[PDB]
Amino acid sequence: VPSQKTYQGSYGFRLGFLHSVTCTYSPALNKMFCQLAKTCPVQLWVDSTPPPGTRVRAMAIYKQSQRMTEVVRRCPHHERCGLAPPQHLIRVEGNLRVEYLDDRNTFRHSVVVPYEPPEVGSDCTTIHYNYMCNSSCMGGMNRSPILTIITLEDSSGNLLGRNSFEVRVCACPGRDRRTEEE
Numbered sequence: 001v002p003s004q005k006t007y008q009g010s011y012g013f014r015l016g017f018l019h020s021v022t023c024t025y026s027p028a029l030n031k032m033f034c035q036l037a038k039t040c041p042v043q044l045w046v047d048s049t050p051p052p053g054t055r056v057r058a059m060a061i062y063k064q065s066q067r068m069t070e071v072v073r074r075c076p077h078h079e080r081c082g083l084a085p086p087q088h089l090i091r092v093e094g095n096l097r098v099e100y101l102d103d104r105n106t107f108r109h110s111v112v113v114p115y116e117p118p119e120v121g122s123d124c125t126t127i128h129y130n131y132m133c134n135s136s137c138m139g140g141m142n143r144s145p146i147l148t149i150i151t152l153e154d155s156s157g158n159l160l161g162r163n164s165f166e167v168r169v170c171a172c173p174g175r176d177r178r179t180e181e182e
């Protein structure tokens with residue numbers, strides 16, 4: 001099982017979220033609610049700047065202990081529907097340097113981009129993720145809750161920082177957020 005323990009590390013790495021309803025985040029639940037294939041802005045916040053060659057990895061895992069060892073991937077239907085391999089749940093949009101990776105021993109998927117510092121006028125770096133299957137899809141997540149783990153890594157894959165958030169991919173994110181909060 002991939003690690004999910006929060007580790008702010010030497011650079012004081014944490015996550016922030018931009019309300020878009022296509023994407024909305026509940027701090028109380030540490031849970032993002034989003035629509036299929038739509039923009040999910042995830043912000044990287046650091047106290048100090050990580051150095052040359054730093055990478056940002058995203059990986060989905062099942063939250064439930066009974067499915068923890070199972071690989072999260074798209075359902076056959078959504079796989080069937082030229083950068084992201086069709087099996088990958090998580091894509092990155094708006095970035096020319098996206099790497100799609102598959103672990104040789106675990107078969108787990110991840111998507112990696114280089115760390116870039118914040119743009120002018122911003123105090124954070126925003127990455128636009130897309131989730132390519134609904135939480136409810138049979139033969140995929142099948143209503144099993146997932147966690148996205150965001151890892152800051154050096155060029156050799158060593159850990160610099162780790163954060164995570166739950167995700168629900170659904171038709172009406174604002175409504176589902178309200179229900180789970182209340």
Ligand SMILES: [Zn+2]
Pocket residue numbers: 074075076077078132133134137140
């Ligand atoms: Zn699906």
